[PDB]
Fold:
Amino acid sequence: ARKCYTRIKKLDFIYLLEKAEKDFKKNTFVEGFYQGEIYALQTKFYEAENALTKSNLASQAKEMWIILKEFDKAMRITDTGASPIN
Amino acid sequence: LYKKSMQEMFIVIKQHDNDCLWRVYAKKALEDNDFDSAENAFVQCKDYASLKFLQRVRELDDRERQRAEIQCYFNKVEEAEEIYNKIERRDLSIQMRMKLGDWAQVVDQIREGTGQDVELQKARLELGNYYAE
Structure:
C-alpha cells in the first residue's frame, strides 16, 4: 500500500495509511470505517455513506459529514442513527 | 481581490460560482494565512480532502510549520525545505523527505550531516530497492 501510494505523489492517502498502521496494533481496525474513508476521499460521498451505514458506524459518519458544513444532510443521517454511550 | 476586502469578494463570487474562481479565492485566503475564508471556499467547492488538510493544519502551534506545510501541499517541496532550514530542526525536513518518497535526496542529506549508521543503512537499502524495481 505504501509503495503504491508513493509511486504516485499523494499526501492524504499516505497520512490515512499512517493512521491505519498506527491503529492496527492497538484498536480493532474495522475495515468498514477505512473503506468509507477511502470512498469519501474521492467525490463519491453516497457510496461511503452506504458502506458506513452498512455494518455499524452511524455516529462517526455523522461527525465526518459535519466537518464538510452540510448540516442538513448530516441531520437527515442523524435522524436514523443512535448514540449508544450512556 | 487585490483591492477590496474578503467578504465583499465572497458575495461577488457567489453569483458566478465557478470552480476556478473558488480555487483562486481559496489560494489567496491561504496565502494571507486566513483559515476561515479558506474553509468557506473549500466547503463551497465541495472538496473533502481540502477540509481534512485544513483540519490537520489548524492544530499547530508555531507560525513557520504551517507555511512550510502549505508550501509542500500546493506543489513546492523546495520552499518547505528552505523554510525548515530557516527554522532549523532538520529532523522534520528528513522525515518529510522520507514521507514523500524521494530516497536520493534523503541519502544526500544524511551524508556528512550526522553520521547516523542505522538511518543511512535503511535509506541506502530503500534506495537500492527503488532502483531495482
Notes: The radius of gyration of chain B is 19 Å.
